[PDB]
From Swiss-Prot, chain A:
Assembly behavior: Homodimer. Interacts with DLG4; the interaction possibly being prevented by the association between NOS1 and CAPON. Forms a ternary complex with CAPON and RASD1. Forms a ternary complex with CAPON and SYN1. Interacts with ZDHHC23. Interacts with NOSIP; which may impair its synaptic location. Interacts with HTR4. Interacts with SLC6A4. Interacts with VAC14. Interacts (via N-terminal domain) with DLG4 (via N-terminal tandem pair of PDZ domains). Interacts with SLC6A4.
Protein's recorded name: Nitric oxide synthase 1
Family statement drawn from the similarity comment of this UniProt entry: Belongs to the NOS family.
Domain remarks: The PDZ domain participates in protein-protein interaction, and is responsible for targeting nNos to synaptic membranes. Mediates interaction with VAC14.
Function per UniProt: Produces nitric oxide (NO) which is a messenger molecule with diverse functions throughout the body. In the brain and peripheral nervous system, NO displays many properties of a neurotransmitter. Probably has nitrosylase activity and mediates cysteine S-nitrosylation of cytoplasmic target proteins such SRR.
Binding site residues for L-arginine: 182, 291-292, 296
PTM statement from Swiss-Prot or TrEMBL: Ubiquitinated; mediated by STUB1/CHIP in the presence of Hsp70 and Hsp40 (in vitro).
Residues of the full protein shown: 302 to 722 of 1434
Superkingdom per UniProt: Eukaryota
Organism: Homo sapiens (Human)
Expressed in which tissues: Isoform 1 is ubiquitously expressed: detected in skeletal muscle and brain, also in testis, lung and kidney, and at low levels in heart, adrenal gland and retina. Not detected in the platelets. Isoform 3 is expressed only in testis. Isoform 4 is detected in testis, skeletal muscle, lung, and kidney, at low levels in the brain, but not in the heart and adrenal gland.
Binding site for heme b: 119, 410
Amino-acid positions noted as binding (6R)-L-erythro-5,6,7,8-tetrahydrobiopterin in the UniProt annotation, renumbered to this chain: 38, 381-382, 395
């Protein structure tokens, strides 16, 4: 943690001065001699050990988060702060863990969002609906909570940010997990010839669902069932009611033939495979949802080679020279696809933000955070959109990345580490 | 140790051992990554010899002569010069080896599959700015080759006491002038406004156009720099037209064929070559995305979108994205039509992956800066976007150095 670091924007010459990085807790993966900025998962530095930690292992982390929370609310040292510490101490003394007050849970979830270096949408961080689901005991009850989340968050197209927080990890053998990587995704099917139908990213998860009894309709856009694990038990399949799943058919403002590709996407991005860490407590099931940046769909989902991979089909209908890469036929089609995605969501009054608007807002959010907080951890490799990078303002914005707690973390896919009953 | 890097598109995993042999810092720490920072933060006799020994060891190892009689005598010979003169002189072979490996080690360069085909011009006997001009003219002519571009570097005398540096004051050998108008607008290239003012102050008579090739401002032996006009017949340029849009040529755009960076420092075995201009050939996006469409550069998006009849009222029409593509189509089409070497960002990044994979197999790794390697448009449709990379500093190296007008103490009263 160097004493005070500046970042420069090379377009506007604005300089920001970072001191928040002094509060960084765990390693980035980098050293003075090697930078891992482009490694997807550079580090295994965790704040607590494997499972049920000893008291001297968990209490220091609790003490820090409680300190931080009461600091945030103009106390620190107050009666309630000192009482809370003694309370957490006794709780760990008798259960090896402790339970967050509702206020602390809301604070923790919002600050995990605020601390998410890879999220360009964090100007919204304090406007987050928190659903406390820590009283949940079964997969049916998990399904009820998620249906309510999806319905509230979708809001007939006027999307609202939300998170639903299921019971925290205890001994590691009673984990709550949503096995889906997102609440809503499309199935992928290995074809007899060798090609893939639907979303290739989801082939493995789709096979698990089939193996568990799901009856695949075997189309290009089959909404996957939920596969929900409560209290360490075997996970259970649930079909989200289709009236809860808002979808947008993709058409083009100028290309009438575009609709005949039969593309669609879903409206609600809802990451459900990550882990929420607050004061040493691990929430292994914590689906959170926002609204899409158009490029997530139009660039990555649709045009990645190992995803829907639609560039050649679109370029054909556009009558483009596909003989050689230097005609930039991929680049031309890409732009049209992302025009259609934005046009479609906007036509149906489903919240979406383009990459120009999203990145501009993030520059403003960065400036706010340096003004009030003294910094904003940001992952350039993830913030910069996957098309037209340098004509967005974040391309020319230097960023500092560091890990602050509360945080959202990655965790292994539950099928790699689950003993079936 | 070992370190794995993964490609998330192909699932190929490579194992880096080369990183164990790096020395200067990256700027990152164990708790902060400064991977997106542009510039993160003379040697004594004692400092010099470990650096020299390191380089001589790796040179003789590279040619399968480590421990040899020639290796050991060279080490002793270098040691004598450092003792005697406080510096030493590279053999021609070492100079060529060192220049190729600084290119090979340039983590920000996507074109390194070409690293070992580098024409090295040894200009360590130069003494005056006139001689510098002669060397640079020859470099331009050789490199340009009537459009069949050849990679080359010209290496001027190394730093001695820091009071006698050789410097090219230009940031590239060929760039276009910029003039700020009283009304606040800029004619030509806004990036070059300050350097254009310096040239005008030194005596240059500007034509005051949109694409005036700047003069060379060359500094020999720490003396004041001097102006030279490159012979116009040596500056190959390409007027930009579009394969489908007849009106595109009416924008009056052109660009030069030879990218030749001239403000960096070449460090070989502790020796510092402060004047070392090097050239290759363009990747199209350098011109069509950054040079033409950076808000701070020629900034032609609105003009091009206008002529495309695009709805420029809302951002979500993606009019800028649409105009950006066509401009980059025109750049590539124009160079190819005029048979001037260029590479498009898809071909360039595919080759880099092949190179990177090859370098892990034969060398144990390939330092690479994802922030610079990924092209400034269409990022994720190029393979490098999905490629994990490790960044670390190997020497020989190209480094940044301060602009000379910030450090030079003028002699001319
Ligand atoms: C409200 C509108 C939001 C927008 C426009 C937005 C935008 C984005 C985008 C574009 C990404 C990169 C997606 C990818 O390439 O995989 C991302 C990642 C992420 N977002 Fe946000 N986000 C929003 C809301 C939220 C909320 C409510 C949370 C949590 C409470 C959140 C937390 C995260 C995290 C942790 C990541 C990293 C995911 C990963 O590492 O795979 N975001 N966001
Ligand atoms: C042969 C064709 C070559 C291609 C296609 C190529 C490609 C590129 C590109 C696209 C960049 C980024 C430029 C920018 O964004 O400002 C770059 C940077 C760089 N190239 Fe290469 N290059 C080539 C040859 C060379 C040669 C011959 C050398 C040295 C002898 C070299 C050394 C470098 C260095 C040091 C940088 C970093 C410059 C900086 O940090 O500003 N390249 N190259
Ligand atoms: C290897 C590289 O880090 C990887 O492809 C990253 C790059 N940047 C990204 N940025 C976003 N938003 N999402 C991603 O999945 C990735 N992938
Ligand atoms: C702030 C950021 O590091 C800066 O804009 C970088 C990003 N990547 C780049 N990549 C290339 N090739 N050239 C550049 O000038 C830059 N600029
Ligand atoms: C692989 N990550 C997929 C994703 C995502 C995502 C998540 C959220 C909360 C918002 C958004 N706009 N996108
Ligand atoms: C500010 N860097 C400008 C540049 C550059 C460059 C340099 C070389 C040798 C090749 C190339 N294709 N591009
Ligand atoms: Zn780093």
């Amino acid at each position: 943690c160097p004493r005070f670091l500046k970042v420069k924007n090379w377009e506007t010459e604005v300089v920001l001065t970072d001191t928040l990085h002094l509060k960084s807790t765990l390693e980035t993966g980098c050293t003075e001699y090697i930078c891992m900025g482009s490694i997807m998962h550079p580090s295994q530095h965790a704040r607590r050990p494997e499972d049920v930690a000893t008291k001297d292992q968990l209490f220091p982390l609790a003490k820090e988060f409680i300190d931080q929370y009461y600091s945030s609310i103009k106390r620190f040292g107050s009666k309630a702060h000192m009482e809370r510490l003694e309370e957490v101490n006794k709780e760990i003394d008798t259960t090896s863990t402790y339970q967050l007050k509702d206020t602390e849970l809301i604070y923790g979830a919002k600050h995990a969002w605020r601390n998410a270096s890879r999220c360009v949408g964090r100007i919204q961080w304090s406007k987050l609906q928190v659903f406390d689901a820590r009283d949940c005991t079964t997969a049916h009850g998990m399904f009820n909570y998620i249906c309510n989340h999806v319905k509230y968050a979708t809001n007939k197209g006027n999307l609202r940010s939300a998170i639903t927080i299921f019971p925290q990890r205890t001994d590691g053998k009673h984990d709550f997990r949503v096995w889906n990587s997102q609440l809503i995704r499309y199935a992928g099917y290995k074809q007899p010839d060798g090609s893939t139908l639907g979303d290739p990213a989801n082939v493995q998860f789709t096979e698990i669902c089939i193996q568990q009894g799901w009856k695949p309709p075997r189309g290009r856009f089959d909404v996957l069932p939920l596969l929900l694990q409560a209290n360490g038990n075997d996970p259970e399949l649930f079909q989200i009611p289709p009236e809860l799943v808002l979808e947008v058919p993709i058409r083009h403002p100028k290309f009438e033939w575009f609709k005949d590709l039969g593309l669609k996407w879903y409206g609600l991005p809802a990451v459900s495979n990550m882990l929420l860490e607050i004061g040493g407590l691990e929430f292994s099931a914590c689906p959170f949802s926002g609204w899409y940046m158009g490029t997530e769909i139009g660039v990555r989902d649709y045009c990645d080679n190992s995803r829907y991979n639609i560039l050649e089909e679109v370029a054909k209908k556009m009558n483009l020279d596909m003989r050689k890469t230097s005609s930039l036929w991929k680049d031309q089609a890409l732009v049209e696809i992302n025009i259609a995605v934005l046009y479609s969501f906007q036509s149906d009054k489903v919240t979406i933000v383009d990459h120009h608007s999203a990145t501009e807002s993030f520059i403003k959010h960065m400036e706010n955070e340096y003004r009030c907080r003294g910094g904003c951890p940001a992952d350039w490799v993830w913030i910069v959109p996957p098309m037209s990078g340098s004509i967005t303002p974040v391309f020319h914005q230097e960023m500092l990345n560091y890990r602050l707690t509360p945080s959202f973390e990655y965790q292994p896919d539950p099928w790699n580490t689950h003993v079936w009953k």
